[PDB]
Design a protein around this ligand. Structure first.
Ligand code: FES
Ligand code: FES
Ligand code: FES
Ligand SMILES: [Fe+3]
Ligand SMILES: [Fe+3]
Ligand SMILES: [Fe+3]
Lengths: 193, 447, 193, 447, 193, 447
């Protein structure tokens, strides 16, 4: 579909990702994906972080959100770390964050925060090799309101890998987000995208 | 407001007017008397190691290009075209032998010189004095063990003199460890706080740790987890506080080499710093070798902070009195194994980065405290930093600087604000020196 | 699914709501819900308020939007009214609002306003008892532009009850929204979420 | 700008410079001379009835904690930690015996006293003068029939004296009805208007009702629906206007007990107020008893407004010259049946709340009028409030205050702005009194 | 469904559009539409503008985005051009814009921009006359981040006509957007809605 | 800042302090000395051709109603109710015999007169001096071949005198072509730049074209595509630059009648302008007839710009020092066929409209250059406009004004800023004239 030598703004990675969704459209898979993401957003929205972990997150998960340094489109000499990790969590690291959220002394959680997620553009495709690896792509708008007049809205595309876990439940085993905004104007990125 | 007379900071740095965190006129005045006058963190050698390598950085509200010259030096310039003032470079880092302005095509060298002007002969003929049209250059650019600072003020002290007594504390980790590198790129987040709020918090605020970060300490299982919710008190002499003439200062928590890092990194770090400490005892002495593997929360006046060992490195970039752009890098020891380095960097960002759960604990504190500074009934109120006053010493046989021989105290706040008042009421560096002739005596007054 | 004693940030109400969607996923119901909400958003967007009332709203409707007072997460003594009603309309009250919108002297309606709604995260489940009561959950982003440079964006989760009315048409019989932002930064909340 | 000399309000309050609604320097000056000087609405007994109950409230741009003491009194304090100025309380209401600062853990009592400081003995020893570190307390806190006001200025008149002639009008509903309660929590919305725009509109603007609210009147079927689009004129002597020395004022629309409420509440209300009126005739007189069930649109200077009977209660919280945070509560009579109370509250919010269709009618009016005050060619223009000038009386045998014996007029604007000019050009309360020695004569000058 | 004499705020055009979706709900068509729009948003998001043109855009396309002048709701005498065209492109005009985006001297494209689209409220209906003309309606939120701290969010409803092109691929033959915000507060509207 | 003494613009307009693009106090000062003093574009006859037709327009930050009177004249008024200052008209265009205020119903005529006040007899009786309550009227409203300008300053020169030497250049296209019409409505976009950035860019910046617009030139295939990325240089005498006493100026690119329009319109336009040019040779002369079909990038001081032939017409509406609201119309020749007119309009918007790919090229240039003007280290820096200085002539036998006989130069910047300095340091029009007695000598000083 995409020739990156012609489509000059396209990253090799992006061209790779779009190819898996263009070939096989499994209508029922897209619907499964939709359900999975809707329920996950629902649990996150009501702040059921333990339920989230228990029901949506695989034990081998990699939960990654990066922030890419701004570099020339035509830059080809400078080769130092291109991105830093806002998140790069394994299951136990998520669990640390979850406990931090539930801790009665997390003063920033009082009064209670309000989250509202909007998941769109869901695409789903089984991996070519691992027949048990489901690729799901989706975009999120995440709205967080707190303390009367604080409002932060986050925007992102999520490249996920979901796999049937124990009890046949499909769980997230990889979430990768290249956060679009280099400098955050949201106070922090302390939300689960 | 008359900054020559206005007592913004009381004698001995005991208190500050709350307005200093909200006053826009004062913010403007700081641009001149704080930021245009003092040393400001730019980057690290490890970020621009090869000729032509450059990053952009903020100095106050100004943007500058910091570029590695062919001769191995580093020069910094205003990121502003000399023609009609368009921002020259739009990326944060790269490698190049020059910068071309996208407005009319003027070409500047990595050395800041005006090198080419399109159609020069045909339009300007020989009129254009290119020699006089180089990018406005940052007067002073110096290094502290690879950490690059710049200063717009040519009259400033050399950086080492500027660091004053604080330098002795940093040297074990900055020099004797074999050197540090900065892992980029940094996280970048805007908070609605005055730059001084996080600056003062990192310079000398160990008191808030147990309470502010109760949830994080508990959750992370880090080596300081015993202080969660002020459950326990740091042992007798668990550390100290120091400050210096030009404002820099830091807290010292003995032995806390793994710092804020969650249990998953504690063993390795504690093993690494211990092994190194052992070699250093022979080279620099037991005390200094211990300082190396001791947790330093330090602010290099005015707006650069760090947590050694934890390896958090911050720049509090000023935007306005209630807005600050936080840059967060990771500092790692050059000789650490790559994988540890990588994981330390992630852990630094995990705890203090854009989504750092620890840094998040601090948000409301920094933001409301700053914002309250604008509130009518608080403007003329006094922020207190009197804790441990009358117990600090100066000229100690072992620990140099004005020093509070207690882990928790406000010694470092006093020194920070003493230097801040002096600059704000001073028109230049000589006046500052004159205003600072009795600095340590002022800081120890009842001792 | 959720243990509120463990998932400490979760309200009893929220835990209740998520349970109805997790058990039975009726794929065709979700699609009906989607259609219903899309058409309703479409009518609202073009300002066909009478059509909205006629085709989307049940005569026994309760249209409620609340604003919860900020209280300590650990507050258990203070027991005065927790929320006020931004909206708490019966069919006739909606009709008053609709007529107010269509009145030729509603000066604020000139020039004409522009609405754009984005409905996402649709979930649907029949009630356990009332086999004719459809529970629909959905999130809305509502964008309102007026007078050249005024732009207000609202964000909310909608807990709806829809029921077949006269002519078999499923109509809204209950909409409940706990508005996420305590202090509105949108001039007013004069929109139908 | 020189506020001692600047004529912001013309003689007799006939006109105001349009800049008063847009000028930021003046806004800052109001913080001192209006908000720090006068009585400001905080809350109601019904909102904090039990010991330890508290709400936060704004006073000007300041935030305060208003807490019910053990002895049944109410004290208010700046919501700001005395240590480094972090905002103490982050919720809007609750019950507690004290407040702990999340930054360093200082514990303040509901009485504002510094009660605990973590590690006090170990860190501060005996140095800390806690007695001197209580929350900055609001000097004056007084009640008007359960309605709690605060004033930062100790020199202010008692609240009753401050209400002046306006008090006589409110007493039938505030006192003689058996008492009111405020149904919380309030709606909260930010509008892009100066606080004075809605303040002046509620203080004396019946003229806009028919036209501004044409659509709402028509739609709601309320008891004033005949005025929609200025179709009809309020009968001869359908009401009046009054104002007072310290700025408060109100319009009176005879008998309009169901007020803005749509037809669905008219019968019940009209029945309720009529029955009560009948009992009151015997106790307070026919006139006053009628006032009770008459619609009062009133502003209690400077930024608290209400519509009795309709039961709308407003606080216009100032943010900046073109920003205001509107708090909307419902006032209900204590002896009304619960269900009516509940429905009156919903109806109040339905009409004047965040999505109040009536309040919405007013938005553009308040916002553009305020915003136009910043526009260069309008700054020095004159807002007119000359309607009914030369027909107001003072010292009437029946209706006290400066009184316009007409439902529609600008009498109340004149009194509001007269008091506003006096304060703005005054440095303290004595100067205000001196500037107000001939207030009513100024207001009736051509009569 | 809609009587514009009763529903006084409704434009004749709007009433026309809603009628085509209310009659026949072809569930499989809505799903095709969804896929088409999701893939198109995906290509646009990764900046595969040539792929977009090649795979999503018909050779006879009209790509139109208008900005309507604010006029009295009760205005009936003033009859000068009601709108201007922010976009009114034929295929070749889009191609000019695409080449401008890919040009190595488009300085504004360095560093690389970040786009994230959220497509919702998809409705689909075949035209009554042209059995090969698919009407698709959808709403977009378009988020564009660049140069560290620049963030622009666009909101719009898209009235599309899609038709099977060469190789049976359904392509866009008409996109019409009446942009909701009269005065743009986004620096420019240089994005493909 | 003292604008009587402050040298914001150096002698001969050679340089400007970068702060002029960021300084808010100066912006405020411009409101008075630039915008309230000079001629500002309002609309075109073609936009309000019939009696009662009106549009709103900005003048500086003020909003005005521009209305076609019954007698065929045009009067303009502040869009502000004379009662309590609510914005009178909320739409951008329409037709009406008057405007009614939605706050209290006051009815103003299209002639600005207060015509009706609800319940006038009953409320005001005979007190209301309506005659004295008309909308604040814009003192001067004049036409240049259908292009309507307004000026709040009665002392201003007639518009033709104001246009000075620039008028000669515009006349072939504005007058001799048979007339232009403006195709509305305009696009409207806010950019984060100072109004002077695009103003100076359109007044005399041909230098940036090749480089700034490299991508667009290349992509569009327009008649200037050879300059993409500064590949080629405009031939010897490919055009010129001129400027005038009151600040207006423009660049002239010979023969570029199809201008920025992509290849799809080149043939038709080049055919149209050529045919017309041929008829004009006989009427106005070869030179002037050629000017007609030559591309003029012009700014009519202070904030109205245009590209004749390309047909782009701009208003840079000032909001604050770093915010500007850009209005973009299309200018077309009245006798062009309708379909071409339609397509020229689309093409104008396509290239320079809200999504104009050309206009987009310029964004970053205008925005960062303006924003850098606020940056501490740039405030006192000098923007250079010295290109071609010492080669401009005045009083040429053929081309009037101060003229640079070169397509690319900064002649027009010099004249623009010379006039800007004069006004900013002047209190009124007489002072400006006094400050401008040697204007052309100042502009040609080394020639
Ligand atoms: S602004 Fe940089 S070349 Fe002109
Ligand atoms: S700021 Fe409150 S305890 Fe320190
Ligand atoms: S503000 Fe216009 S009539 Fe009163
Ligand atoms: Fe902290
Ligand atoms: Fe009103
Ligand atoms: Fe340009």
């Amino acid at each position: 579909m995409i020739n990156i030598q012609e489509d000059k703004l396209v990253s090799a990675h992006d061209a790779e990702e779009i190819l898996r969704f263009f070939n096989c459209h499994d209508s029922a898979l897209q619907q499964e994906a939709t359900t999975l993401l809707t329920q996950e957003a629902h649990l996150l929205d009501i702040q059921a972080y333990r339920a989230w972990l228990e029901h949506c997150v695989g034990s081998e998960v990699q939960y990654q959100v990066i922030s890419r340094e701004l570099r020339a489109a035509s830059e080809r000499r400078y080769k130092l770390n291109e991105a830093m990790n806002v998140y790069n969590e394994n299951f136990q690291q998520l669990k640390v964050r979850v406990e931090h959220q539930l801790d009665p002394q997390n003063w920033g959680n009082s009064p209670k925060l309000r989250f509202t997620r909007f998941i769109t553009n869901v695409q789903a495709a089984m991996d070519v090799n691992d027949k048990e690896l489901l690729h799901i792509r989706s975009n999120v708008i995440l709205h967080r309101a707190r303390r009367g007049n604080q409002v932060d809205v986050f925007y992102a595309a999520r490249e996920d890998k979901w796999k049937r876990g124990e009890g046949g439940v499909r769980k997230l085993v990889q979430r990768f987000v290249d956060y679009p905004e280099r400098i955050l104007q949201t106070h922090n990125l302390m939300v689960f995208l | 407001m008359n900054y020559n007379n206005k007592i913004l900071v009381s004698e001995s740095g005991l208190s500050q007017k709350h307005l200093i965190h909200g006053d826009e006129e004062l913010f403007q005045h700081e641009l001149k008397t704080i930021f245009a006058r003092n040393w400001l963190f730019l980057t690290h050698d490890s970020l621009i190691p090869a000729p032509g390598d450059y990053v952009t950085a903020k100095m106050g509200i100004d943007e500058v290009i910091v570029s590695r010259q062919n001769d191995g030096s580093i020069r910094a310039f205003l990121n502003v075209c000399r023609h009609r003032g368009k921002t020259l470079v739009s990326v944060e880092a790269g490698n190049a032998k020059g910068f071309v302005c996208s407005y009319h095509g003027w070409g500047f060298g990595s050395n800041g010189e005006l090198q080419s002007v399109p159609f020069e002969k045909d339009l300007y003929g020989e009129s254009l004095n290119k020699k006089c049209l180089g990018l406005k250059e940052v007067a002073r650019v110096e290094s502290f063990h690879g950490f690059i600072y710049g200063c717009f003020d040519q009259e400033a002290p050399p950086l080492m003199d500027y660091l004053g007594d604080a330098a002795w504390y940093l040297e074990p980790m900055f020099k004797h460890s074999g050197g540090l590198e900065l892992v980029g790129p940094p996280g970048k987040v805007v908070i609605k706080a005055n730059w001084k709020a996080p600056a003062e918090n990192f310079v000398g605020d160990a008191y808030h740790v147990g309470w502010t970060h109760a949830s994080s300490l508990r959750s992370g299982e880090s080596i300081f987890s015993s202080l969660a919710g002020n459950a326990a008190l740091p042992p007798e002499g668990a550390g100290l506080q120091m400050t210096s003439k030009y404002g820099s200062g830091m807290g010292v928590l003995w032995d806390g080499y793994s710092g804020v890092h969650s249990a998953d990194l504690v063993p390795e770090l504690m093993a690494f710093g211990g092994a190194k400490q052992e070699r250093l005892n022979k080279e620099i002495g037991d005390v200094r070798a211990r300082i190396y593997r001791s947790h330093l929360n330090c602010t290099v006046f005015p707006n650069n902070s760090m947590l050694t060992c934890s390896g958090v490195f911050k720049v509090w970039n000023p935007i306005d009195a209630n807005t600050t752009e936080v840059w967060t890098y990771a500092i790692v020891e050059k000789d650490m194994p790559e994988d540890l380095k990588r994981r330390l960097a992630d852990s630094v960002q995990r705890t203090f980065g854009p989504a750092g759960f620890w840094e998040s604990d601090d948000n409301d504190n920094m933001e409301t405290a700053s914002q309250n500074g604008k509130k009518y009934q608080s403007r003329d109120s006094d922020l207190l930093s009197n804790l441990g006053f009358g117990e600090d010493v100066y000229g100690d046989a072992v620990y140099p600087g004005v020093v509070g021989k207690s882990a928790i105290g406000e010694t470092s706040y006093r020194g920070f604000y003493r230097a801040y008042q002096a600059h704000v009421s001073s028109s230049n560096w000589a006046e500052f020196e004159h205003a600072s002739s009795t600095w340590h005596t002022e800081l120890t007054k009842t001792t």
